[PDB]
Ligand binder design. Structure first.
Ligand SMILES: [Cl-]
Lengths: 165, 165, 165, 165
């Protein structure tokens, strides 16, 4: 084989792990690395850690630093693992950067942490890696076994899924 | 009308390592229930996927598969299958004119989904996205990449598909 | 086979599970039921749900209701799954009830939720079930592969383990 | 002096279903690395457990086991073992005067620890507690209960130990 894929990690629920000192979940090590370790990949794939800050908390400065970091990648196929609560805002922001116009940028994450039983994370990672390799240049959210247009997408808290507007 | 999520993908299960499970009576692995059903149960799909059983066995068998695939209404098809004869099945489906408008992807796992350290969940997400996003044809989706069956072979001892140059 | 064992659940970390609506862990269904489902038990074992309230929050009234509930059991072998933060206080309280003097009462739980990867919970449950069947009448904490005397025990936050005083 | 946690228990591994793992080359399960080591890695033990390898094979073999067990300094011994011949091993150890002061418990799993839905973690906790708490002798600890080897048999098709009345 495939075109080279670069993966950026911005934390979120997918990466949550339990810590005794917190008596609860923190943003841990990136779960995408745990999934790809056993995927027996053939192709060129490399992972870059960007942030473990609470995704809810992302400022314009955080989003800007992500856009610049993704621009540092010569790869044209990009996966960004991310919190779901501000995924639409990040995706809309990246969609407005002319610097990224030639890249396929896919955001994904998980509704349940990878390190918790019953997680969507491994499926989402496989689906998003294929989406990043296969879709035309642009910025997408890959969740729920489908591809969302960030400009026409919202997270619906009642449904527990992204939906079209 | 209120939005209706489509179910554009149909999955057929032909068994294979991906579906292996432990049985006390055999004191070993048999082909068990389809593991792709377990992955999709927790994938929080926006739509749904019709999963249909074709075989749990380890020329006529390939013909029954072509018939089931060719009869499907869906234009996006995933067949979970053993890796030992996946190339043979894929090459046979490749020659059926009935499939000309369909994206047909074969996949599976080198490690059973029910065994620790399995590629299965990743493979299922990657293959579902491949079946949705690739142009019509017949493909093997494994190792985070897409293989042309006519130009692919299985290496038994390394648990990998590899090109024929 | 063994003498009949009664298991009471008072929640705690062992039982934590992820909820989308909380965006984090809540006290969920009792994890001991998930472990015993695959233990292939021979003996008489039954589970009773007592509480899912935060164990940190337990009042004297909560502890008293637990002591009375355990007294309702005709079984002489008792496992109580519980939060670690107030486990010593509950165990010291039960140790002072003449009503329970003829019973073996073991408290246990987990430093990491059963539903999180890398959990001590399944081992703790097996070890505590044996302790409840095998120890002389009295009240114990079974954690870390050993038996603690509640009167001479504390949880050491720095160590992440119970230790003797 | 500052408290020193003892390591009163030694574990010997003779293989068996508990340790089975998937190998691509065999296209099936072999006896792999000892699963009891994986369980104890996350058990947050106050002490430690010396784990020693005796066999990974499927009269002389039983003699080597008696020798290793009889040479141990520890008075509390757990032997992880296949369930098919556990009774034979246990009966043989039962007749060795060298073991008269030792609590020796055999255990294992009807489902491999590396397969979903395994009894192994529970069995290991239950058996470690049995090895610490039972009076000297030789025992089989399975199904959440203690068996007298002289009066026990393995039922192959049900994956259970059962009494001889
Ligand atoms: Cl939490």
């Amino acid at each position: 084989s495939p075109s080279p894929l670069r993966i950026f990690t911005a934390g979120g629920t997918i990466d949550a792990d339990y810590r005794l000192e917190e008596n609860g979940l923190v943003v841990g090590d990136p779960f995408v690395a745990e999934v790809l370790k056993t995927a027996r990949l053939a192709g060129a794939v490399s992972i870059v850690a960007l942030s473990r800050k609470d995704s809810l908390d992302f400022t314009e400065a955080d989003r800007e630093a992500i856009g610049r970091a993704v621009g540092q990648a010569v790869e044209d196929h990009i996966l960004l693992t991310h919190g779901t609560d501000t995924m639409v805002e990040t995706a809309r922001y990246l969609g407005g950067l002319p610097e990224l116009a030639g890249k396929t940028v896919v955001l994904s994450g998980a509704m349940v942490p990878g390190r918790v039983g019953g997680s969507d994370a491994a499926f989402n990672i496989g689906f998003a890696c294929a989406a990043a390799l296969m879709l035309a240049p642009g910025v997408y959210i890959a969740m729920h076994g489908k591809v969302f247009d960030p400009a026409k997408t919202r997270k619906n808290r009642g449904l527990g899924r992204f939906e079209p507007i």
